[PDB]
Amino acid sequence: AKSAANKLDWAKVISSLRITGSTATQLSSFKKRNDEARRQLLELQSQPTEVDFSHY
């Protein structure tokens, strides 16, 4: 899922160790990870869109 992108990302992070060119590149990957982790918990938190007209 999102984890496919991220599995390649972190494999690449520990590869990115082996490049000293990074400065803020790892911070950009870290940021994409942050908000990616935010959207999944957002999506898991999700209320049913509308109030139950049956019960509620």
Partner 1 sequence: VSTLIPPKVVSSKNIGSAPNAKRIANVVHFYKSLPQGPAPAIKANTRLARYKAKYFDGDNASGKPLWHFALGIIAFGYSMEYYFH
User: What does the binding site for partner 1 look like in residue numbers (CB under 8 A)?
Assistant: 16, 19, 21-25, 28-29, 31-32
Helices and strands counted in the chain (H then E): 2, 0
> How many residues are given for the chain?
56
State in angstroms the smallest separation of the CB of 53 from partner 1: 42
Residue 27 contacts residue 35 (beta carbons within 8 Å) = no
CA 50 – CA 9 distance, rounded (Å): 37
C-beta of 21 vs 48, nearer to partner 1:
21
The distance of closest approach from Cβ of residue 19 to partner 1 in the complex, given in angstroms and rounded to an integer, is 5
Shortest spacing between CB 44 and partner 1, in angstroms: 24
